[PDB]
Design a protein around this ligand. Structure first.
Ligand SMILES: NC(=O)c1ccc[n+]([C@@H]2O[C@H](COP(=O)([O-])OP(=O)(O)OC[C@H]3O[C@@H](n4cnc5c(N)ncnc54)[C@H](OP(=O)(O)O)[C@@H]3O)[C@@H](O)[C@H]2O)c1
Length: 307
């Protein structure tokens, strides 16, 4: 039901994702925790939904559920990736969530954006990132008790090596896009060697490339008398990642956490692993790539040509 971080803190295996939950965010959060038994919520300042997450968490805790039994993650956005911007960003996140600490605070992307950056970015709008300086400030959040664990999202092997060479407190978690068709075994192996837990974002393929109607997924679902979503999520647990599926529909929220006490047989697991690693749903191109002027002229540069 949970994974153990190097700090000894536990992370629930299934959490609720909140990107694009919109005006249904607060309801979704409360349903997940109070009805469906979720103990993990994944959000971010950049999602625009943190105030609503705060309302949902507050409602969910009104019936006695303790704060210590919940695991809440937020993320530091690209515009705030400078040492002196870390704390104001965290303060606003905590205020919006109506919380006093986070369980997990993640670098959302290892790229610094100028204020008012465009999409795609104009010349000059992707700034130099002081990764070491930002991480040092984040380590101070842990020392002060404002964050129980810190980590990253959307890294490469090269960037993880850079971070591990400077970090006094290594990243607890590396949150990456993972699903059939984008396994990123390369990052998963790097994290395993460095003792970093992986959380799979977009575990269903996101909205863009949702896998619930993929024929192999459907066959396995049929064979096991489970939903396609359950198959996709159980597959991830069997690989050893946590998962943060997003839904704003009550029935899916409830279904999506029913991935315990049954298993996908090895031959079916292998067939799902066999789906080729096409391309990622979230490339980062529209955030960081300027094709005419750089410094990142193509998506492959965002991923250090490891993709
Ligand atoms: N940079 C990053 O770190 C990054 C990027 C993306 C996501 N994330 C995090 O990871 C979370 C999950 O990723 P995601 O939101 O991209 O997508 P996802 O969880 O892979 O998929 C969500 C999509 O699947 C649908 N859905 C949910 N349960 C389903 C089921 N059982 N059967 C069929 N369809 C189902 C949802 O629709 P309904 O909502 O209408 O039910 C929505 O369209 C995010 O919400 C966010 O918290 C992080």
């Amino acid at each position: 039901g949970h994974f153990v971080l190097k700090s000894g803190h536990t992370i629930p295996a299934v959490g609720l994702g909140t990107w694009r939950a919109g005006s249904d965010t607060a309801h979704s959060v409360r349903t997940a925790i109070a009805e469906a038994g979720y103990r993990h919520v994944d959000t971010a300042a950049q999602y625009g939904v943190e105030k609503e997450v705060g309302r949902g968490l507050k409602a969910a805790m009104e019936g006695g559920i303790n704060r210590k039994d919940l695991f809440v993650t937020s993320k530091l956005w690209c515009t705030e990736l400078a040492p002196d911007r870390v704390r104001p960003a965290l303060e606003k996140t905590l205020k919006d969530l109506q919380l006093d600490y986070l369980d997990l605070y993640l670098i959302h992307w290892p790229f610094r954006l100028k204020d008012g950056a465009h999409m795609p970015p104009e010349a000059g709008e992707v700034l130099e990132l002081d990764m070491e300086g930002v991480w040092r400030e984040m380590e101070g959040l842990v020392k002060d008790g404002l964050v129980k664990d810190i980590g990253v999202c959307n890294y490469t092997v090269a960037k993880l090596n850079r971070l591990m060479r400077s970090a006094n407190v290594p990243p607890a978690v590396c949150q990456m896009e993972m699903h059939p068709g984008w396994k990123n075994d390369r990052i998963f192996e790097a994290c395993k060697k460095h003792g970093i837990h992986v959380t799979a974002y977009s575990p269903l393929g996101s909205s863009e490339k949702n896998l619930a109607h993929d024929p192999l997924v459907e066959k396995v679902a049929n064979k096991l008398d489970k939903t396609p979503g359950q198959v996709l999520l159980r597959w991830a647990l069997q690989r050893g990642t946590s998962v943060i599926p997003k839904s704003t529909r009550d029935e899916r929220i409830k279904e999506n956490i029913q991935v315990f006490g049954w298993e996908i047989p090895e031959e079916d697991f292998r067939a799902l692993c066999g789906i080729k690693d096409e391309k990622r749903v979230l490339t980062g191109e529209e955030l960081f790539v300027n094709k005419t002027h750089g410094p990142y002229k193509s998506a492959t540069e965002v991923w250090d040509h490891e993709d």
